[PDB]
Design a protein around this ligand. Structure first.
Ligand code: 7HY
Ligand code: 7HY
Ligand code: 7HY
Ligand code: 7HY
Ligand code: 7HY
Ligand code: 7HY
Ligand code: 7HY
Lengths: 223, 223, 223, 223, 223, 222, 223
């Protein structure tokens, strides 16, 4: 698994690979690991499938629950705190093998500067979290390759589109060096999933855009 | 890892993928797992790289050693016994993690029928061996997938070319369902290695032939 | 054990073998592993017999329970979720040996496209689920052999009859390569169980048609 | 695995199934487990393949070695003792999992009565042996099914041919109730191996005769 | 211990031996292991004596309890389910050595065809149950000898008498090959217990009839 | 520890950091992990210090031993084999925790094409080796960061100088993301060590040039 | 991690590094480890991030909770006790790896002598506490090095500013000899965090001040 997220001027982007394994065996090619959890938040998760989907689902339900009870959505800090509490709650099972870590990408509507209002928060198995002030982050078995790639490509991020390309390319490098992360399947037409978040909300990036970027990167490395 | 071997009228074919892993990380893209061990036999090995290479090298040396000492090469059965004894010798280390299993493909010059002179022999970690009378065999983490693919495609084997095609395609399905097995890397131009053996001896199949077969299988599954 | 399920135009088909073992001993020849759980759903289960049957029975009761309490059946997603939760509840006992995995086949009455309204969902020991968009799926000790067979035979599926034949042939390959999966017993007249589900509901396929198909497969493979 | 042996008037017969497994997976369909160890003796071995084949090979070499050194073959008692000593020698490795048990069938050329000159000897993991004066014996995972079948069918043994039928049928029942023992494959034309031993020596029973008897049994149990 | 049960046209028969052991020592010669649990059902149990007798006693009590509470006896399926739940309830204690498995024989008065209304249900330590469609079944340390005997004698079962004799003979073979199963004691006048169940109900077969069959079997095996 | 090696037209370069640790404590700031083992080969080692230095020392001794006994140096393949056999020999102690892996960089004088005669060989704890046809390789706790950095910077390698810079920068990224890899110490004046190998042989890169390259990278990222 | 605290005439200062690790990998460069817990107390914590942040936040909440409930802040002894209790409460999780130790720096408004009203309290994993009468203290993986540095530099503490310089220099030495403690990053402009506390309350030391002191130290150690 590899989940990546990076800040661009005025928003944030998150993308994830599509491969699911049981040990060395490929058990899935079309899985979705990045979920829109509310109008301004997306979550990408690495780890045990059952636990990850449970995280995404339960979290979305909790956030909208607070919003309907109290007539107002949680502050972003509050959203972070609830996700962390959820992870910490799973710690016991995580130590026996049902481990899953989330990566949080959001747009803080109450932030002062709407152009840096994007937020990227990483978590550990104990619920400890860090808000990434360096602009990008990744989680999963390919997260080191992806981060080290973005370290070189991040200066090319000037808007949402260029940031989306850097995200897809980081996933490409991850899948290149990690067998548990899936690269683009040009035969089946399966590409990474992406979510883009700005002041207008969180939207799924359409498949075709990611496919165009994928073919562009592949060509770039061939000739 | 996936190593395949199949009999065709008048010869035998063996092919292997090019991937090396350490856990989930890709540690090699160009490795060689199929070795010509003598003029009429090739060995492909799965398992720990160091032990596999030592097997191939030491075995080739042993065969040519006997051939120079006694002026005549071993009967094929004798070659079988030697590889088996070598494998059994390693059992202790195999238990401690240095496990490697070979697959032997040969052409028996002393066979009655020059068309069924192909031989495929499989081994286990304790040296037990079986001569495959069903025409094909595979070993490695993707070997089950390769075998099940060849079970369906084997009726199409009529000459060296079709047999080589079925072999490469079995490797394709294997890499398709196993992350530890590498498929064709069309970007870097890295394809499986193949060895073909007939009455004229054992030759390495050039990479361009396999490249053509790979592209053929791909656009065969694309439409 | 092997259970297979595949989508065909306008419906879904699921079939399961009939063998029960205790270690190497054959303890059953006539076992039924595919259960109609409601008017539009069948469940086939692999694993400990007690746990498998208990799953099927309790699941059917739960679905129809909701249907009578609320005057309407669950949406298909709801059926998936309840099965997953049931599996997850058993995780503790499964870790001690009472392990069972189900495979879900259903027809979604609320789907827009009647042709693709078939649904096949697979589960793992932790309740994680996947809706298979590639058309077929299997579970059990022979599941990899069956999946790899259907990978080659699936293009021949155009109706319920051809799909049922591909299913039975997949079970044949599974039982061919798996000692824990039982093939057709022509001496005793015992054949796999099959369930077909379309807009008209879920019905048991009559044993005679499965017999016909089994003999067709056998005869095509002997000459 | 199942090996059977029975005494008939004027000779002895031994037969073995053809299946090789790794756990539940069928890893071989054609293996030979019954070996002619000298002009008047055959050995069939059950257990791990490496140790079984090693037993057969080494034993045959030992017997013929004594015969060429001393110009005369061992008494049957001597053959028994040497096989026993070999098993006891392997006891340590067997206790570590490399376990194999043989079954000995011979014709004692020095017996007074040529009708009761048949000999059937069974062994345990510590080398203890028993000469079976009840006429039949079996070894392997299906040996209890085979023994109990012969307990009912033994009265039908009147010559080498009927004894061969009873042997093949006992193997049939063994394969019927034990998944680790393989029955006759009428699709592939693979049947158990048999060796018959009388005053003229030990000879392999031709494939076609066993095939005939197998179909006789099958059509006998169907109608 | 050995308990056998078989279906005959219009009824069912169950019989059990009389031996009780502590390790190798004979601790009982006249014990009863087959109990009439209700007007149309008998249960025979193998395993720890305290647990077996408690199963039989509590089970009969449960059946008659339901009958008196609801004015009607349980359907046979219900009887199965309650016995299964009882076994599963004992599972934990079973894995500490207090293990007992039952074998259920009944006559389903609500079946459509009165001549095939016989029912034989076997259970495992986890409560999994199977209704035996092949006509006979056994449980205990001698159960495999008994089953393999009935496999040969079952074609002779045409009525209650032939079914009874076949059962008693199966117990004879079980006791012949199993030291934990007791054969007929002609010195003490102690023979297996048997229950016959048809449309008129379940009755204990008198000792005289069983002794008669025992002597018949012995002289059949002597001459 | 992080050791990097990369091929450039007509040669090869290898560089390694200077940090030695015991757990979290820094126990050394100036160590040398890249050694010239013969006129045309250098070896850099990661792992337990004792095993690493013993590897380098015994390896150099073995090569020169064969050269003096037989009047000719080992073929490059032979050098590979001897280093591999040494690692395999250490496997047992390595399993007790005394693990060290080498990285081999050489110039093959018997090579067909003098431009592409550079060679880079990596090893695992069992003596398995791989000759890298992709131009660069690294070993140690920061080797993932260094490899992934070179994956982006390698297209900039056109001569010995650009290759040396790329190596030093990969070490910079490695030390940036790995606490067990030491970056340039501008206060104490301690920089990575580097060895360059071409047809004229293997020579130590002088400290001054690495210091310059480091300060250029630093000023470039600030 | 390294947290230092030292008393100066009329106040106290506490400072902490900014590095976060996962084993050898640096997972953070800007983390905050020193928290102002109330107007007159700051807490810095070393260990697992989740537990440390939870300690700081929960502690601040508890103190202000008492202040609002009872209209008056806790005595310093009370503050110390509550923190001590909080740690002892975490002891169980600490035994399993979720270990965190705090270091408390405060200004006792009720102290008799205002120029020595600074207080420094250290804690162990069981909640045992000690008030440091020697003027300075440290906690974390670099605390030995920082303490031994302050042991030499403490005579230079004459006002708040000299105390701040000595604190920063101790952190510098700690990061110099410990890889788990991060020094000043002049490229990214990230420096230790510092809090100063006197009678006017607890205030965060501005980053520019610490940067000045850091660069001064570096220049002093280079030339
Ligand atoms: C979707 C469920 N299926 C098919 C039935 C799988 O095969 C998933 C696989 N389960 C397992 O490997 C089973 C783990 C387990 C639990 C209890 C006892 C023993 C073993 C998995 O989680 N693999 C992990 C390593 C993984 O791939 N994780 C990647 C991942 C991340 C976020 C969302 C995802 C959604 C679906 C699938 C994967 C997802
Ligand atoms: C070429 C060697 N390199 C680079 C230095 C590797 O990373 C290989 C990798 N080592 C390891 O996994 C080392 C594990 C180990 C052994 C002993 C003690 C501690 C740890 C491997 O064998 N992987 C296995 C799973 C594998 O990929 N096996 C496939 C394979 C088969 C036949 C010939 C091969 C030759 C080269 C590489 C692979 C080969
Ligand atoms: C039906 C009960 N009988 C006859 C007495 C069996 O022999 C079944 C067998 N029990 C066992 O092997 C007992 C395992 C156990 C339980 C408790 C403590 C320790 C060990 C089994 O489940 N085997 C597994 C491997 C299996 O065959 N699984 C296949 C299977 C799948 C779905 C529904 C099924 C229903 C009936 C039989 C089999 C079924
Ligand atoms: C023939 C070699 N092959 C193919 C590579 C096999 O798969 C055989 C299989 N080895 C194994 O299962 C490997 C055992 C092992 C050794 C060390 C560490 C871990 C595991 C086997 O013996 N199976 C047993 C259950 C068996 O089938 N035994 C039956 C048997 C009896 C007499 C002669 C035989 C000759 C060939 C095959 C089987 C024979
Ligand atoms: C109760 C009858 N007596 C005399 C006091 C026995 O010694 C029987 C013997 N007890 C024991 O072996 C005691 C074992 C034990 C109990 C608790 C903790 C640790 C160990 C037994 O169960 N034997 C087993 C192997 C057995 O024979 N089982 C067969 C059996 C089946 C159904 C009903 C039965 C009724 C009486 C005797 C046997 C019965
Ligand atoms: C010898 C240098 N000194 C000073 C006495 C050290 O403390 C080094 C440190 N010893 C240790 O960690 C002791 C290992 C040990 C062995 C047996 C039982 C318990 C513990 C080390 O090797 N650290 C490893 C992690 C390391 O830093 N390795 C880096 C390294 C690589 C290549 C050549 C090197 C040469 C000198 C120093 C380091 C070198
Ligand atoms: C901030 C959260 N992140 C980002 C994903 C981290 O990587 C932190 C890292 N987690 C871990 O090391 C995870 C440990 C764990 C927990 C449960 C099961 C298995 C393993 C850590 O605490 N490292 C320790 C060694 C550390 O650096 N501790 C320093 C420290 C002290 C006070 C406040 C802090 C706040 C944030 C970060 C660090 C802080």
């Amino acid at each position: 698994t590899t989940i990546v997220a990076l800040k661009y001027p005025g928003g944030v982007v998150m993308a994830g690979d599509r491969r699911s394994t049981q040990g060395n065996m490929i058990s899935g090619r079309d899985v979705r690991k990045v979920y829109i959890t509310d109008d301004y938040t997306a979550t990408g998760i690495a780890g045990t499938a059952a636990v990850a989907v449970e995280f995404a689902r339960l979290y979305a339900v909790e956030l909208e629950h607070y919003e309907k009870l109290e007539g107002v959505p949680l502050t972003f800090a509050g959203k972070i705190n609830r996700l962390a509490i959820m992870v910490r709650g799973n710690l016991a099972a995580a130590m026996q093998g049902l481990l899953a870590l989330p990566l949080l990408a959001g747009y803080d509507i109450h932030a002062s500067d709407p152009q840096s209002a994007g937020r990227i928060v990483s978590f550990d198995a104990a619920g400890g979290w860090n808000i990434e002030e360096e602009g990008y982050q990744a989680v999963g078995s390919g997260s080191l390759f992806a981060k080290s790639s973005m370290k070189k490509l991040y200066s090319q991020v000037t808007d949402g589109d260029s940031g989306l390309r850097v995200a897809v390319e980081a996933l490409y490098d991850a899948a290149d060096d990690d067998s548990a992360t899936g690269g683009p399947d040009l035969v089946r037409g399966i590409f990474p999933t992406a979510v883009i978040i700005d002041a207008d909300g969180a939207v799924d990036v359409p498949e075709s855009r990611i496919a165009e970027l994928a073919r562009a990167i592949i060509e770039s490395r061939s000739g």
